[PDB]
Amino acid sequence: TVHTAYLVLSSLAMFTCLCGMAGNSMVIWLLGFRMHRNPFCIYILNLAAADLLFLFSMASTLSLETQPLVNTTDKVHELMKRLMYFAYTVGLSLLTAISTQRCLSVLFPIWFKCHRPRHLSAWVCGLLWTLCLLMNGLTSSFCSKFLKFNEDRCFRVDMVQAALIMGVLTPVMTLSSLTLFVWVRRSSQQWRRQPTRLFVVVLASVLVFLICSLPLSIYWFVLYWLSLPPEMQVLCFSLSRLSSSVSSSANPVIYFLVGSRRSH
Amino acid sequence: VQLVESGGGLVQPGGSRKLSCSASGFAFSSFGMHWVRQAPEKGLEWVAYISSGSGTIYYADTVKGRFTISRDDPKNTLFLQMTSLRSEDTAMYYCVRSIYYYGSSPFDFWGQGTTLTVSSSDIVMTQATSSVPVTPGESVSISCRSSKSLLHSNGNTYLYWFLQRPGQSPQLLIYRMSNLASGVPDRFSGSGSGTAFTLTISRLEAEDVGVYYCMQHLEYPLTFGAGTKLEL
Amino acid sequence: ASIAQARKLVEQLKMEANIDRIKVSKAAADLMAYCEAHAKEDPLLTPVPASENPFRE
Amino acid sequence: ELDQLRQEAEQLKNQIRDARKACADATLSQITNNIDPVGRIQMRTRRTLRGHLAKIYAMHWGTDSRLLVSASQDGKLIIWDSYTTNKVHAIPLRSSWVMTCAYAPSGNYVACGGLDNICSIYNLKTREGNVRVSRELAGHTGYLSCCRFLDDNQIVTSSGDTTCALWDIETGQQTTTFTGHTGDVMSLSLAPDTRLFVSGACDASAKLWDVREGMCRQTFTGHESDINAICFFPNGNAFATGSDDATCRLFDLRADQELMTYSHDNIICGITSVSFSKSGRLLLAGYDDFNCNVWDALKADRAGVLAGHDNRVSCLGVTDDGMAVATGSWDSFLKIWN
Amino acid sequence: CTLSAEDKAAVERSKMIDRNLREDGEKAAREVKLLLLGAGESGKSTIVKQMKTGIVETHFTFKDLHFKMFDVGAQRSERKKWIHCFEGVAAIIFCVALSDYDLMNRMHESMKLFDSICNNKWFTDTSIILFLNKKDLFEEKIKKSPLTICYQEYAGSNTYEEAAAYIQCQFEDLNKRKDTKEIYTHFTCSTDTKNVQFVFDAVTDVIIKNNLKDCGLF
Ligand SMILES: CCCCCCCCCCCCCCCC(=O)O
Ligand SMILES: CCCCCCCCCCCCCCCC(=O)O
Ligand SMILES: CCCCCCCCCCCCCCCC(=O)O
């Protein structure tokens, strides 16, 4: 019963992760030394790299589960799971930054065109990567049995991370996306033709975020410490992992393919 | 196009001084400036090089540490701060402008020079002639020797020729092996191949008499040679 | 331009009227001869070995 | 009378057509038979010049086959070293609307002109270390569409005011003015011996001019739409023309008639620039469909394509020794094919 | 490194040239380029006299925004050969004088020009700021004579408001495609002050649309 369902979920996660890192690698390839004068490509390139790392970590973790061991496997598995969570956190950060940039492009168009520093994207991404690495290193060093399995400190660092995520990433992302929606509905949609494509892609982005990317964060941060009954933690973990794998596999489609102005 | 240089004078050993040269009449900020030394009795010695935009800066092995080179592009001035002056540093310093692109003529202009008195690997480029006497209307052929091949893999041989008429700064005659500069008569003609090179003058006049120097630009530091004086 | 323009056009056409002409077979043969004469010195026609190519790498 | 003058003109045109078709013993294709074709030759891009930030509209090679000048709508004239992709010079322009650039055979000057109705001559080799304007050749009442150097002192400039002109750079005046060309003339191509020059206009008519006499020696027709590209054959006795009809036409000065037309059903886009390979066996044409086609001059077939451009190929040129062909484009990229 | 010393200095100079080219391009990308258009003596002087031979380019600033407006009316040549040079402008400032409906008819020529330009294959997605100036002269002419003085297709009232609205509708109906570009219309005269603001709102709208097309929502 539950074992067969778990096998099915793992197989689907493996196949979707294969498709995901294929798509992410293609997106990084198509954004190399070109397609970068547009201020909406450094974020997408960084997100493609982060999602590639995240989905590769998923596929590797599933492969390690299919070939379990005792001692040598455990340490590389722990390190690369920490890598997966680091990539997850940085991908969420990049989604939030992308949505905020999209909102600010229409809220302040004069500033976005003739006042925004050309490298502001670059060092914003650098700061995001640095902060995510710092927080994930702290969480791994206070949560991994390899270095320090301090249960109280693991819980404290997880609570801090969850508070920061649910008080910054989700509110700012949702608010920026909704503000873009409302502003283009009440400022341009009335006079010209209503931009239905804008509305549909914005709603799709918020939907896929809130119901595919958050699940893993909320699970691995809060549900890991709410003393869930047995035979229930597996279901939530697998559902969250599959949802995040689907979100990271579909992020290139919803961000680069829909937005290929030059290649169309 | 003139390069008037200032500063200098009598400095006690171990002291400090700041050489200056003000550029005018040309696009100073696009030229890579040099400093070249000449002892009161010896030939020319290369001191320092600064590129356009203050990028690569070079010093000779004998000047490193206590010599520093700097430029002020808005002020149209080139500086050379010197500290801990040794007895071998008494010489006359020339400010030399140079620009580097395909087909250009480096070292095309030299400053008037300033004097400095103090109280008291490399490419060997020497020529085995000196104080050659010759009469106007004849033909001369002075030659220069290089330690190794000056022919680069791109096909360019980096050998320059300079004439220093007495009482005035040296001027460029040949800005690469077989490349005549601007303003010099067609009688001059550099030549050579491989390792050995020479300079020939078909019908010399009475005013093109002086010390002739062969210099290399293949590698840094830039090594001149001992002169080949010409007289009546 | 009421009268002088048309006369100028007629004169210009007369100028091209007196131009000598040669059979186009001869001109085509001459073009083919020139094309087959300088065929060796045609680097775009014949890719030379990379030793002489200055755009190799 | 006016009716008499028109009838005389029509009779003259009919007589000229009869004389033209009398000498047409055979076409080039019929003669060029039982001969090995050039073959499906394909070339690979060797360099990629990546400095411009707007549409590139003109390029011209140097006589040394090393230097290269390109013009673009960002108000920049860049001189390139094609061997190393080094930027020798980058010349700002007062007017960013330029459609042609010229490179002197002596290499001391460049010329560029466009919608500002002025041809500017720039001094490459100065005592100071910069590039400076020498003279501005005002005197045309339209946009300048082409310009070529006869020598350091004579330059011939086409224009959008239906006229070509020859200029004396030192005095800045037109020594001779070439008129009698309905519609704006879009291109010109000096003879290899620099005693004649052809020019194609919007009336689909290509005229051959005498530089000293100042009179149109011959006039050629056959294009259905306006003419954008023109270039002399290396032999000097022929020249090719590119028009909006998606057709390239080979003419002949000594026959006064068209030799053959280079076209394909799959090609409907206009032709931007044309040039000849050394020995005149290949015809290199730039198109609107982002691609350059290698036309075999003797036959009427495509020797090969090169593509490699994401936008319209606006200009192209071949070196004096035939080492390489450089193509400009509207994507701000130059490619040195070999 | 297989490079001579002068080769290295050449690459350094080339890199300095590259830096200057990048700076120039980044400075140009923060500029709005407008294509002024319309028949001569059609109020073009009035709309160009608010602030600041071939193309007569003007540069003006408003609310920390820089405009590069180009006048190409004096070209007097085949437009189709050089019109693609202006593809990619922010907007077209098309100027039409209302009073030139009887002065062989200027309004028909202006309508033909507007139909030719607004429907150009290069400009299928650029907004058009249709300036309709000389409205006081239109007032005086309508007081002297109705619009039906030369046009029998009109059947409405002989008042300034309705006639101006009819002309605006006739102009705005010339474009086949209303689903790809926005036509902005304004009424001005010799002495206006808010005319400079209308182009600011138009360019702000097209800037927003450009950003949306960049991110790919549009
Ligand atoms: C509080 C923890 C870190 C906060 C992370 C915030 C990430 C989103 C906000 C920064 C991105 C948007 C900044 C503007 C970038 C742009 O539009 O170019
Ligand atoms: C860290 C986030 C970066 C975003 C900074 C927003 C700066 C806005 C500056 C004022 C907006 C000016 C642009 C339009 C002019 C206006 O406000 O009316
Ligand atoms: C392991 C984390 C590394 C920390 C730094 C991450 C930086 C990623 C790259 C961000 C910028 C990439 C391209 C920016 C260049 C540009 O501004 O055009």
Numbering used by the authors:
A (entry chain R): 22 to 285
B (entry chain S): 2 to 121, 124 to 235
C (entry chain C): 7 to 63
D (entry chain B): 3 to 340
E (entry chain A): 3 to 54, 182 to 232, 240 to 354
Reproduce, without paraphrasing, sentences from the article in which this PDB structure was first reported:
MrgD, a member of the Mas-related G protein-coupled receptor (MRGPR) family, has high basal activity for Gi activation. Mas-related-G protein-coupled receptor D (MrgD) is expressed in sensory dorsal root ganglia (DRG) neurons, the cardiovascular system, and the retina.
After FLAG-affinity purification, scFv16, which binds to the interface of the G protein α- and β-subunits, was added. The interactions between MrgD and Gi are similar to those seen in other Gi-bound GPCR complexes. The hydrophobic surface of the C-terminal α5 helix formed by L344, L348, and L353 interacts with the hydrophobic patches, including V1273.54 in TM3, and L2015.59 and V2055.63 in TM5 and L2196.33 and V2236.37 in TM6. The hydrophilic interactions, including R2828.49–N346, S1263.53–N347, R2828.49–D350, R1233.50–C351, and R2186.32–G352, further mediate the association of MrgD and Gi. The intracellular loop 2 (ICL2) of MrgD forms a short helix commonly found in GPCRs in the active state. ICL2 also undergoes hydrophobic interactions with Gi, and the side chain of I13134.51 is packed in the αN-α5 cleft formed by L194, F366, and I343.
